[PDB]
Amino acid sequence: TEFPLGCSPNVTTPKNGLSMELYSYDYLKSGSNPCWDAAYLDPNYPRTGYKSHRLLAKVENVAGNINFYYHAPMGCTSLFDTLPQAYNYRTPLTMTNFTMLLYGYFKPKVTGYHTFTISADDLLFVNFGAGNAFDCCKRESSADDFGNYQAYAVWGSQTAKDDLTVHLDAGLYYPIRIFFNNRDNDGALSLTLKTESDPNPVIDFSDYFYSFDDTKDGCPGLVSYD
Ligand SMILES: CC(=O)N[C@@H]1[C@@H](O[C@@H]2O[C@H](CO)[C@H](O)[C@H](O)[C@H]2O)[C@@H](O)[C@@H](CO)O[C@H]1O
Ligand SMILES: [Ca+2]
């Protein structure tokens, strides 16, 4: 989907940042082999499965540089540390093993081709565009209905990095859904953006992430090129 669908909320003053939900990702019993839970690889773990784990927090206004690398002191051990400031979540959590979901809308600054590059330990699955992530101003009623991943990265597999090159209009807000998991040990998340004119990758998404309330009618995009 080189031409993803965007949305036109036409809201007075849009809310900055994405929404985030954190969930437990416990280790297997302390004599299991391997030590980590393999659920994160089940096809429905990112859709239904994470809901069977403990909710840690629902957070709003996630904006900034969301990238991090966490070096675990040791493996097969649940250890506590903190996320970067952009996450709006200040208390220590199990950085060695956890599940994290982000959702909202991406707003381009400049119309044209955008390349989002991702890499992750252990997993990062990205949906992008109306329908694919969720429907315009109808997130709640389409929350679990996301399509094929527009990018996906799994540590240790023959696709440990991925990118997505899409033509975007600055006039639209694009549904986005980012699902992360760390199963054990080190954790890492990299999202960068490359546009055709700007020389270097963008890593600070402060001005690009937004949240909008759902509306009865929805808010389909009012820019189209057919
Ligand atoms: C493959 C494997 O299990 N490696 C062990 C380490 O755990 C993995 O580490 C990688 C990072 O290199 C990654 O984060 C993955 O999610 C982890 O499961 C770790 O357990 C280490 C113990 O000191 O030993 C490796 O065998
Ligand atoms: Ca890991």
Integer CA distances (angstroms), 98 to 6, 75, 143, 209, 223, in order: 31, 14, 21, 23, 38
- Locate 75 and state its tokens: 């493996």
Whether the Cβ atoms of residue 173 and residue 108 lie closer than 8 Å to each other = no
Residue 12: Cβ-neighbour burial (10 angstroms; 0-12, 13-18, 19+): exposed
Asked if 139 and 103 touch (Cβ cutoff 8 Å), the reply is: yes
Asked if 154 contacts 180 with a C-beta cutoff of 8 angstroms, the reply is no
Cβ atoms 113, 97 nearer than 8 A: no
Nearest protein Cα to ligand 1, atom 14: 186
Cβ neighbourhood burial of 168 (10 Å; 0-12, 13-18, 19+) = buried
Q: Are residues 79 and 94 in contact, defined by beta-carbon separation less than 8 angstroms? A: yes
Can you tell me whether residue 186 is helix, strand or coil?
coil
| Ligand 1, CB cutoff 6 Å, lining residues | 36, 74-76, 121-122, 155, 183-186
Q: Name the token pair of 163.
A: 């990118």
Burial (0-12, 13-18, 19+ Cβ within 10 Å), 161:
middle
Domain boundaries, the chain: 1-226
Q: How many CB atoms lie within 10 A of CB 101?
A: 20
**78 burial class (0-12, 13-18, 19+ CB within 10 angstroms)?**
middle
End-to-end CA distance of the chain: 14
The experimental technique behind this entry is X-ray
Backbone angles phi, psi at 187, to 5 degrees: -125, 140
Phi/psi for 86 (5° steps) reads -50, -25
Amino acid at 111: T
Q: Name the 3-class secondary structure at 85.
A: helix
CATH class of the region 1-226: mainly beta
Residue 79 DSSP one-character state:
-
**The pair of three-digit structure tokens given for residue 191, joined into one six-digit string:** 């999202």
Taking the CA of residue 185 as reference, the ligand 1 atom at the shortest distance is 14
Ligand 1 centre to CA of 184 (Å) is 7
The minimum-distance atom of ligand 1 relative to the CA of 183 is: 16
